[PDB]
Amino acid sequence: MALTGTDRVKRGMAEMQKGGVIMDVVNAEQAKIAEAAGAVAVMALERVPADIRAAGGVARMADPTVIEEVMNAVSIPVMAKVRIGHYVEARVLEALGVDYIDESEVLTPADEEFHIDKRQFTVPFVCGCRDLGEAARRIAEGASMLRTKGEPGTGNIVEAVRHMRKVNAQIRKVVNMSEDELVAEAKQLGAPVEVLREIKRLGRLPVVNFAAGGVTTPADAALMMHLGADGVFVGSGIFKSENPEKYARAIVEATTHYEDYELIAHLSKGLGGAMRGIDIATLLPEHRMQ
Amino acid sequence: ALTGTDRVKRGMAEMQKGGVIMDVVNAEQAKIAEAAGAVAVMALERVPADIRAAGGVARMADPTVIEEVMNAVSIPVMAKVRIGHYVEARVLEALGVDYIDESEVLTPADEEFHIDKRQFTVPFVCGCRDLGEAARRIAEGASMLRTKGEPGTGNIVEAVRHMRKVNAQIRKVVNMSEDELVAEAKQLGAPVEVLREIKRLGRLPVVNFAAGGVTTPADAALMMHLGADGVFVGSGIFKSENPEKYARAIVEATTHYEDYELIAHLSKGLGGAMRGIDIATLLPEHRMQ
Amino acid sequence: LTGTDRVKRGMAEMQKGGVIMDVVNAEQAKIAEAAGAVAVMALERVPADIRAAGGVARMADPTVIEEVMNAVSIPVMAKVRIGHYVEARVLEALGVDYIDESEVLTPADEEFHIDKRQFTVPFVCGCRDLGEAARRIAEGASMLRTKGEPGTGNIVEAVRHMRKVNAQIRKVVNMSEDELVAEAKQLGAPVEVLREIKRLGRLPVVNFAAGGVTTPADAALMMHLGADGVFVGSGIFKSENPEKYARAIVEATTHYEDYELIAHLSKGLGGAMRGIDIATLLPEHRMQ
Amino acid sequence: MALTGTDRVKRGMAEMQKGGVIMDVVNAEQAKIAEAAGAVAVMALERVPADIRAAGGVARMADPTVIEEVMNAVSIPVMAKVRIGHYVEARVLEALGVDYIDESEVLTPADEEFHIDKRQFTVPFVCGCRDLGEAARRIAEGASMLRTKGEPGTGNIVEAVRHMRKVNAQIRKVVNMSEDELVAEAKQLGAPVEVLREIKRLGRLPVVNFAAGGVTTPADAALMMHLGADGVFVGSGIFKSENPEKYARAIVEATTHYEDYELIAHLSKGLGGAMRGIDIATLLPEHRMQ
Amino acid sequence: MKIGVLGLQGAVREHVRAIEACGAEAVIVKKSEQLEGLDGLVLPGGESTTMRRLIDRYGLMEPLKQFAAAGKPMFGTCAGLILLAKRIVGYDEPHLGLMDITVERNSFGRQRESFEAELSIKGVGDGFVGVFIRAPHIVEAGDGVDVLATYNDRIVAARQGQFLGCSFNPELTDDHRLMQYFLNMVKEAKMASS
Amino acid sequence: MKIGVLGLQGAVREHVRAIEACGAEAVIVKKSEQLEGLDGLVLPGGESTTMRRLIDRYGLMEPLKQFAAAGKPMFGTCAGLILLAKRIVGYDEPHLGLMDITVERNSFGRQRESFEAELSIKGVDGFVGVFIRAPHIVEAGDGVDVLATYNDRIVAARQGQFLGCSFNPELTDDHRLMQYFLNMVKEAKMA
C-alpha cells in the first residue's frame, strides 16, 4: 500500500522549499543559472511578468516543449503557470511531470468566477492571495502552498508587503481570537470557517506562504523574510537586471542570511543596474483572483 | 455511554418529524397540547403575538414555569433563549430542557455572535431565511432548523418565502457542478464544508421545520406540501377561539397533509382565527446574523 | 374526461354577459339569484369591509361556503390567498365551481402563484396588463378579471386595466409576426400565449370587469369598454337597497347599449356606497 | 410523404455535428485544410473575426461566390453567417444551399431589436447566447442550435467559459427546480416558459450547444468539452496561428480525446506560435444580441 | 416483498431507507386501506402519544390488531416498541398490547441523557451501535419472549414470534443487520403461509 | 450485454440512450483497447470524413476489422453505413469495406433537402426514417438482404452480422430497429 497525492505529500513538498528562492525562467540557460545560483526551484513560462505587462495580449500556459527543455536542464523542481480556472492546462502540466502548478493571476484568467478544483489533482498547486479570506478560499479549493500576489513586473514590493502584512496580521488575530467568534469572523472575511479553525488549532497557517511580486534587491528579499515570508519568488528582478547571474546569487544569499545586514550590504554593493520598474497609476492590471 | 454526539442531537430532531410543536405558557396548555397530539411543547413567558403586542425586552422564561411544564407532560419540552445568551442556554440545559431554541422572537443578547452550540450536550434549533444563514447556524453547532417567518402575525407569507428559498437553494447545491461550490459558498455567506456535506448527502443534514404565522390546517398542510419536516405553532392555537379544537386540527392536517377532503372537513367548524397583521412593520423580527 | 382546458374555460364562457355577486351569507345569495346573478362569490367580509377592518384576510370558513351552496342553484365561486395551494385544494374538495386566486385576500406567497394547471376546478385571476394576464394563463388560469381597486366604489382602476389589456390585445393581434418574441419580453409575457392570442384573433380566456362597479352606468360602461361581464361585491350590499341595486346592475349589464332603459334603471336607486378617492399607500395590486 | 424543414430534421443535423470542430474559412484552400484535419463543418466568411475586429467597418454576409467556392471544395457541411435580423441575407444563403445559417453577432447587426424569424425557414440556424434566457428566446424564434458568444477574435476563452458555465448552471437549476416555480423563473430570466418546461420535461437542453469564442489551444478546446460543450467553433485561433494545418489537427484531436491529458500534452507540444489575442478593456464590442 | 412503515409521525423516512437498502419495497401507511397486501410492518421512532392519538382518531387500532392476527411480522423501534407492549408503567391501558412485555417510558431521563452504546444482539451480531433517544426500557419480559440484547442489565431488544422490538433506533445508523434480521422474519412468515 | 458506440465524433449520446433504453450496457469507444470484451458495435451518424481521419491517426482501422472478423455484430447509421461500405461512389478506396454494397454520399442533396419519411422495414412498419444529409445504397450484393426502400432507393440492409441504414433511427423515440440489432448481438454471442 503506497499512497500518492496526499495533502501531507503535497504540502510537504512545499515545506521542503522554505528559506529559498524560486526563479522565473523562460529557457534552459536561465534555469541552469538559477540552479547554479542556488535557486530551490524554477518557474517556467513564455514571458517574464514585466514583459507580459509590456506586451499585453492573452497570456497562456507555456509551450510544453519549453517546459521539457527546462526540466531536462536542471535537477531542482520545476514549477509552471496556468491560467485561472484552466483545468486542462493544469492536467497537461501534471501529465508533463511538473512538480508544482501555479494557478496564476499573471496569466490571462480563463474562468473569472471559478478556480480549478485543485483537490482532484495529484500534483500540488500554489496560489496567490491578498488576505486571509482569499487564502482560505484557495486552500478550500485544494491549494497546497500560497504566495502574496504583489504587483508582478513592476519592480515594486509595496503590494507584496501589503499582502504579507495583511495575511500575517489576520493570522495572528485568528490564532488568539475567542473561539466563539470564528464563525462570524469567517463570514466577515469571506473565509471557510473550517480553515480558520484549522489555523487556530494549529497556531499557524497550515500551508507555506511565500513572498512574490516586485522583489528586486537583496534588501527586498531580506525584508519579506523579515516580515515573515517562508521564501521568495523572483522573476523580473533577476533577468531584467544588468547581471542576472550576479543578482541571483545575491537574492539567494540575502534570503538565507536575512538578518545579516553587513553581509546584505556587501551583497548589495557591486550589483549595478536594477530593472526600472513602474510606480502605479495602472487602471486594471493584476489582482484578478476571486 | 457517549452523550452529546451530533448523531444523538440530530436524531432527537429526526424523531420529531411529521408533527407539531406547540408554544405553551403553562401546564394546562401543555396538557392540551399533549392531548391534541403535539410532538413537543415550547415553553415561554408570553406567546409571540403577545410578545409583539407588549414589546419590551423578551428573555428566557422563569425556570419555575419550565419545570411546571415538564412535570405536566411526557412529550419533550423545548424552551427559547436570547440570541447569544450562553448562560441562559446553560441554565435551560441544567434544567433538563430537551431542545433549546436560540430564538429571534426574544430580544437578542449578542447582535454579532450566536451561541457556540457545539459546546453543549443538549441540542439547539435555530431559525433561518436562506441556506447561508442555515449553514452558518449549522457550523455553530445547531442540530435542527426552522423558518423564521414573521411570528405573531398570523401570516405564513414569510415562512413560505423562507422554506421556498432554502429548499430551492438546497436543490441547486445538490445538483451543482462540484467545482463551483467554493464560489457558491462565498456568494451565500456559507461555510463550504456544510455545502459539501449537503451535496454528498443529497439533502440537508438536519431537520427543517416551518415556523411563523401558521394559523390554519391549510397553512399547516401547505408547509408540509412545500417540503417542511414539521411545524411549530404558537399564536395561532392559543389566540384562536378554541385552542383545543385548533390543536387537533393542525396536528391532523400536518399528518394528513395530502388528504384535501379531510383537511376540508377539519377546517369546517373551526370558527374564529387570530386576526393577524398585514405588514408595514418598521423593524420587527429577522434579527439573526 | 374532466378538468380539460376546454371544460375549465367553457364554464367561464357560460358566464358571459352576466353579473357575479359577492355574498357573505345565504340570504344575500338568494337575493343575488333572485336578481339574476350568474353566480355568487362567497367570502367572510365584503372587500370594502376587508379594507376597513384590515388584519389578515384568508379563505372563508367552509361552513359559510356550504351554507351558500345549499341556498342557490347558480354556481358558487370562492377566494383563496395568492399562492395558497391547500386553500384551493380545500375549496376544490368542497365542490366550489370556480376559484378566485385573489389579491383582495392577504397573499400567502409573494413570489409564486398557485400552479393552477394541477387542478380540476378552474381558476379566475386578476390582471392589470397583458403580461400579467399571460403569466396567469401560463400558470393555468382559465378566466381573468381586472384588478381594479376593490371596496373603493371607484371604477377608475378597472377602466384603466380593461383599457390597457384590450389595447394590448389589439396591438398583438395585428402586430408583425416577427416582433412577438421581442414584444413578449417587453411585456414580461410568455410568447406562446401571445402567439395563441394572435392565432386566435382574441384573448383565449374570458375577461371580466371587477373593482369599484357601483352603478348601472358603471356596469354598462365596462361592457362598453369590452368586458365579458362584471363582478360586483361592495356596490350592491353596501348600498341602500341591495335587492334593488342587484336587479339594476344585472339589467344594465345585459342591456348595456339601451341608454333610455339604463336611465330608467338608474332612477330610483337612492344611496350608493360612498367610496374612497385614492391616496392609499399600499392596498391591492398584489399579484406578480 | 417526405417532410422537409421539421424541427427534428433541423435539430438532428446539429446532433450530427457533436464531438467535433467547426472551422471558420475565408477560401477553398482553408476549407480543404479543415476537411483534411477532420473538421465536422466549415463556416464561410469574408474576414476571420480577429481581422473583423482589426479592420472595423461594417461586416456583412459573405460574397456568394466565396460560399459556392467553399461548397465546391469540400464534402462536409458548409455554414455561413448573416447579420442579426437580416432576413434576406438568410434567404440568400438558404437559396445557395448553405447547410446551417449563423445569425451572428460578429457581423454588424442589421436589426437591433428583432432577430430573424427562423421558424419560417427550411434551413436551420445556429445562434449565440450568454445565458438561458437569451438561449430560450433564440429557441422561441426558431433557432435549432446554439453556441456561446465568447469574445471572438480575442484569443481569450474567458467569456466562452463564463457563458458555457452560466447556461449549464441555469439548465441544472431548471431541470431540478420545483415545477410550480417555472413561470416566475422564466420571468426572472426573460425566458419563454414553454422552453423551460421543455427543458425540464426532457431533462436537458433540447438543442445542441457549442463553445465558440477565443478557442486558441488544444487545452482550450478540451476545456470546453470538459465544461459540457457539445463541440467547438474555431476561427481565428487556427488561421492566425503559425501553422494552421498543425493547429487544426490538434484542436480536432483534443476535442475528440478531451479527457486524455497525456495525448493533449503531446498534441500541444510542437505547436509553435498562437495568435496574440486581446486582454479586454474594450468599450462596446460583441454581446449584441437581445 | 412489501414492508409497511407506520407513517403517522416520526422517523419514517429513515426506515424506508433501510428497507429499500435491503432490497425490499417500502410503503408508508397513514390509512387502514394501505395495510392490505403488505408482508410486514414497521412502527417507527417518534412520539407514542402522538401515534396513539392519531391511531384512535382514524380508527387504525382494530385494523392493526387484525394485521397482527393475520400473522404479519411487526417491528417496533422505541415508540414503536411502546405501541406493541402489553403493559406500560403508569398506564392503566396499553396501545396495541401485542407483546408480553412491560415497558417504562423515558426511563433513562431526558434528551440530555440520550446516548449511544455498542451492543451484542443475539440473532444479529455484535458491536451494533444502539442509539437511545429519550428511550424507554423493558422492565419485565414474559416466558414466550426471547431477550435479544441488554444494556447495563436492562432489556433493550426482544423477539416474540412475529413481533420484534427494541428500545434504541437502528434506523439512525448505517448498520442494517437488524433490518435484515427483521426482513428474514418476514420472508419466513411469507413462505410459511404457502 | 455490452454494446460499443464508436465515440470519435457524431450522435454518440443518442445511440447510448437507445442501447440503455433497451436494457443493454453502452460503452463509448474512442480507443482500440475499449473494443475488448464488447458483444457488438455501433457506428453512429456524424461526419464520415472526420471519423475516418480519426480512425487513421489512432490506428483503429485494423482493430475494427479484427473486431469484425471476430464475428461481432456491427450497426452503421448514415456515416456509420458509409464506414461499412465496400464501395463509395467517387472513392478509389473505401473505409472498413466490410459490407458488399456501393454507397453514394450526399445523394439527396444538402441539409435543405434533409427529410423525414415513414418506412416499411422487413424484419422490424411506419418507422419514421430521418435522413440528414443522407447517402444512399446504389447497389447491393447477393449476400445482402434489403430491409427497406424509399422511392426505389435502398435505405436499410443486412449482411449476416452487419446492419446498415441511410437514416438515423437514434433521432426517434422508436427503438424497434435497435431491438432488432440487439437481437443479432444476442444470437451472435452464442456462437
CSV table of C-alpha atoms in Angstrom, one decimal, chain B residues 1-5 7-9 11-12 14-19 34-40 70-71 73-77 93-99 121-123 203-204 206-207 229 248 251-257 259 262 265-266, chain E residues 7-15 17 29-31 33 44-51 53-54 57-58 60 77-79 91 105-106 109-118 129-134 151-152 169 171-175:
chain,number,residue,atom,x,y,z
B,1,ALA,CA,-22.4,5.9,27.2
B,2,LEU,CA,-21.4,8.5,24.6
B,3,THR,CA,-23.7,11.5,25.1
B,4,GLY,CA,-24.0,14.8,23.1
B,5,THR,CA,-23.0,13.3,19.8
B,7,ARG,CA,-26.0,11.8,15.8
B,8,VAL,CA,-27.9,11.9,19.1
B,9,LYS,CA,-28.6,15.7,18.9
B,11,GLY,CA,-31.5,12.1,15.9
B,12,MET,CA,-33.7,13.7,18.5
B,14,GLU,CA,-35.4,13.3,13.3
B,15,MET,CA,-37.7,11.8,15.9
B,16,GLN,CA,-39.9,15.0,15.7
B,17,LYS,CA,-40.7,14.8,12.0
B,18,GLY,CA,-44.2,14.8,10.8
B,19,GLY,CA,-45.5,16.6,13.9
B,34,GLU,CA,-50.1,16.6,24.6
B,35,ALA,CA,-53.8,15.6,24.4
B,36,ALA,CA,-54.1,17.0,20.9
B,37,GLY,CA,-51.1,15.1,19.7
B,38,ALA,CA,-48.3,17.6,19.8
B,39,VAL,CA,-44.8,16.0,19.4
B,40,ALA,CA,-43.4,18.5,21.8
B,70,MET,CA,-42.0,19.5,32.3
B,71,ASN,CA,-44.0,18.0,35.2
B,73,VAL,CA,-46.3,16.2,30.1
B,74,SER,CA,-44.5,13.1,28.8
B,75,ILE,CA,-43.5,14.6,25.5
B,76,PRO,CA,-40.3,16.6,25.0
B,77,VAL,CA,-40.0,20.1,26.4
B,93,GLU,CA,-29.7,22.7,29.8
B,94,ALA,CA,-29.2,22.3,33.6
B,95,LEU,CA,-33.0,22.2,33.9
B,96,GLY,CA,-33.2,19.2,31.6
B,97,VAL,CA,-34.8,21.0,28.6
B,98,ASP,CA,-34.9,18.7,25.6
B,99,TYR,CA,-34.1,21.1,22.8
B,121,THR,CA,-24.8,18.4,25.2
B,122,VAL,CA,-28.4,19.5,24.7
B,123,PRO,CA,-29.3,20.2,21.1
B,203,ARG,CA,-30.1,16.7,1.2
B,204,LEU,CA,-29.9,19.0,4.2
B,206,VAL,CA,-30.5,18.4,9.7
B,207,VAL,CA,-34.3,18.6,10.1
B,229,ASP,CA,-40.3,18.3,8.1
B,248,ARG,CA,-56.3,18.8,16.9
B,251,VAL,CA,-52.0,18.1,14.2
B,252,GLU,CA,-54.3,16.1,12.0
B,253,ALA,CA,-53.7,18.2,8.9
B,254,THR,CA,-50.0,18.2,9.4
B,255,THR,CA,-50.1,14.4,9.4
B,256,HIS,CA,-52.6,14.0,6.5
B,257,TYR,CA,-51.4,16.9,4.5
B,259,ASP,CA,-55.9,14.5,2.1
B,262,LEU,CA,-60.1,15.5,5.3
B,265,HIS,CA,-63.5,18.6,6.9
B,266,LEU,CA,-61.0,19.6,9.7
E,7,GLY,CA,-46.3,6.9,8.7
E,8,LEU,CA,-48.4,8.9,11.1
E,9,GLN,CA,-45.4,10.6,12.7
E,10,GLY,CA,-41.7,10.1,13.5
E,11,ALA,CA,-38.6,8.8,11.8
E,12,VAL,CA,-40.5,7.2,8.9
E,13,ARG,CA,-38.0,8.2,6.1
E,14,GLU,CA,-35.1,6.6,8.0
E,15,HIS,CA,-36.8,3.2,8.0
E,17,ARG,CA,-34.1,3.9,3.6
E,29,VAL,CA,-49.0,3.7,6.0
E,30,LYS,CA,-51.2,6.6,7.0
E,31,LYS,CA,-54.5,4.7,6.4
E,33,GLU,CA,-56.6,0.6,3.5
E,44,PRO,CA,-41.0,3.8,13.8
E,45,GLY,CA,-39.4,6.0,16.4
E,46,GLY,CA,-41.3,9.2,17.3
E,47,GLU,CA,-43.9,10.2,19.9
E,48,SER,CA,-46.0,7.3,21.1
E,49,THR,CA,-48.7,9.7,22.5
E,50,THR,CA,-48.9,11.3,19.0
E,51,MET,CA,-49.1,8.0,17.2
E,53,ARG,CA,-53.8,9.9,19.3
E,54,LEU,CA,-53.8,9.6,15.5
E,57,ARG,CA,-58.9,9.3,15.6
E,58,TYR,CA,-58.6,7.4,12.3
E,60,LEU,CA,-56.4,2.3,12.9
E,77,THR,CA,-38.4,0.8,17.4
E,78,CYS,CA,-38.5,2.9,20.6
E,79,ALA,CA,-42.1,4.4,20.4
E,91,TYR,CA,-50.7,3.3,32.2
E,105,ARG,CA,-41.3,5.2,29.1
E,106,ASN,CA,-38.5,7.7,29.3
E,109,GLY,CA,-34.1,10.5,31.8
E,110,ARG,CA,-34.5,13.3,29.3
E,111,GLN,CA,-32.8,14.2,26.0
E,112,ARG,CA,-29.7,15.3,27.8
E,113,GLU,CA,-29.2,11.7,28.8
E,114,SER,CA,-29.9,10.3,25.3
E,115,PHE,CA,-26.8,8.3,24.3
E,116,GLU,CA,-25.2,5.7,22.0
E,117,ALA,CA,-23.7,2.4,23.0
E,118,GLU,CA,-22.4,-0.7,21.3
E,129,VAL,CA,-24.3,0.8,17.7
E,130,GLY,CA,-27.5,1.4,19.7
E,131,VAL,CA,-28.9,4.9,19.6
E,132,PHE,CA,-31.1,5.7,22.6
E,133,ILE,CA,-33.1,8.9,22.1
E,134,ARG,CA,-35.4,9.5,25.2
E,151,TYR,CA,-27.6,-2.7,28.2
E,152,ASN,CA,-26.3,-2.4,31.8
E,169,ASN,CA,-33.3,3.3,17.0
E,171,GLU,CA,-32.7,3.3,11.6
E,172,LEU,CA,-30.4,6.1,12.7
E,173,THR,CA,-27.3,4.0,11.9
E,174,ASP,CA,-25.9,2.9,8.6
E,175,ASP,CA,-25.9,-0.7,10.0
